[PDB]
């Protein structure tokens, strides 16, 4: 019987759960919505996480736990799932006939998947990558070396840029730059499963050292991207920023259509993206998930909870519109491929605040698609372990330890985090 009262919260920016609750109520009319919204972000995470913990909650839970632009960010989410806050989701979805895990991104979607427990559904996702226009690209002359680009590869760019652009930033914007490259790179360092790190390594030391390389280029604020009417595009043409990669927007379908109608505006030319230049000898292209749905553990209505979860997953929410200004990259196969068909045909030549825009290139779909179904895996990472990394490499830019010394600092205070 699906019905009964429904307990959620609302973050503050959220406009996609009143699309769920007409949903869920179109089918299965006797569900209760019991929504309470909240106008404050920190009012919201400390009354959510605080009820979990001590056996409260909402039924159903939905989070933006990591460091995209609306997102209420959380230190240790995957140590609070662990925890044991939401129940296991396989005997529902092992019961469900009308359920299919083919038809979303099963390498995404592994990542709720912990200790052996589907704890949360990862609803979008994200994937680290720098972009840039590419006639930017063939004034530096590597047009096509940056999609075979290592980190060092990169830095040594880097410094040849610094000695030739001695006036403009290399990259943009914010800090988000500095954490993508450490989402990209804190896999080759920690042993969630062993619960033991490497950061007191020679790889990590070189690591250090590659991206304080990278960092003297200059990576300009975000404050100083918004100054600029164009935003990072406008910026991009004056050649205050060379490469971009930031952890704001998620590269969805929509955003590689805007990002390419808005450079081709500013120079006939096309978005370039690539993964980001990785550390190591093998071939990680590391994803982590932005948006996730879970039960409470402790809720009384499962089954009616576990109703309105899969609504999250259908291919009419993850394309929807409110779907694509607050959440990440959709996990739902079927989303992705109608999206990408829609901005590659007539629906792309439309009119942009105002731009003439252009249906997405054969080009550009291409390397898009060589991105998103290039991931290897996607880890819920603790933020908290990439703020030790990003503390560490701050020590070591800012003159106060050696590359060695702040090699040990991480260290530390990983392994004795990963050990409670």
């Known amino acids: 019987v699906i019905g009964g009262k429904i307990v959620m919260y609302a973050a503050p920016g959220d406009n996609v759960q009143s699309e769920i609750r007409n949903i869920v109520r179109s089918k299965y009319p006797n569900v209760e919505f019991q929504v309470v919204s909240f106008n404050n972000a920190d009012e919201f995470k400390s009354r959510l996480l605080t009820e979990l913990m001590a056996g409260e ?19 240790t989410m995957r ?26 991104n099963e390498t995404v979607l592994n990542s709720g998947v912990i200790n052996g427990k589907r704890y949360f559904i990862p609803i979008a996702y994200d994937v680290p990558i720098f972009w840039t ?120 379908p929509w955003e590689l259509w805007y990002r390419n109608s808005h450079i081709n505006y500013y120079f006939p ?45 259908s291919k009419e929410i993850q394309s929807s519109q409110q779907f694509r200004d607050r959440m990440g990259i959709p996990v739902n196969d079927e989303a992705i491929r109608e999206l990408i068909e829609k901005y590659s045909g007539e629906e792309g030549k439309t009119t942009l605040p105002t731009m003439d825009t252009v249906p997405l290139p054969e080009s550009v779909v291409a390397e898009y698609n060589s991105i998103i179904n290039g991931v290897t895996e996607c880890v819920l990472v603790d933020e908290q ?25 991480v260290q530390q205070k990983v392994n004795l985090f990963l050990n409670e």
């Open 385 to 409: 372990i990439i703020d030790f990394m990003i503390e560490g490499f701050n020590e070591y830019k800012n003159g106060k330890m050696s590359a060695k010394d702040a090699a040990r600092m």
């Open 57 to 75: 909650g909402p039924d159903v839970i939905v989070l933006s736990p990591s460091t995209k632009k609306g997102s209420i960010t959380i230190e």
């Open 269 to 313: 030319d096309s978005i370039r993206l690539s993964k980001f230049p990785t550390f190591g000898d093998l071939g990680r292209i590391v994803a982590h998930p932005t948006d996730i749905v879970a039960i409470n553990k402790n809720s009384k209505n499962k089954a009616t909870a576990y109703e309105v979860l899969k609504v999250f997953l």
């Open 133 to 252: 226009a590419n006639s930017i690209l063939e004034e530096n002359n590597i047009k096509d070396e940056i999609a075979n680009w290592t980190l060092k590869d990169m830095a040594d760019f880097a410094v040849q840029f610094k000695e030739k652009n001695s006036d403009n930033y290399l990259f943009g914007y914010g800090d988000g730059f500095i954490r993508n490259i450490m989402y990209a790179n804190w896999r080759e360092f920690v042993d969630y499963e062993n619960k033991q790190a490497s950061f007191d390594s020679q790889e990590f030391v070189e690591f250090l050292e590659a991206i304080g390389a990278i960092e003297k280029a200059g990576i300009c604020d975000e404050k100083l991207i918004k100054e600029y009417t164009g935003m990072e595009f406008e910026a991009l043409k004056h050649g205050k920023i060379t490469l971009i990669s930031s952890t704001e927007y998620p590269i969805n």
């Open 79 to 104: 140590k609070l799932v662990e925890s044991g806050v939401f129940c296991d989701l396989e005997p529902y979805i092992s019961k469900d006939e009308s359920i299919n895990l083919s038809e979303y």
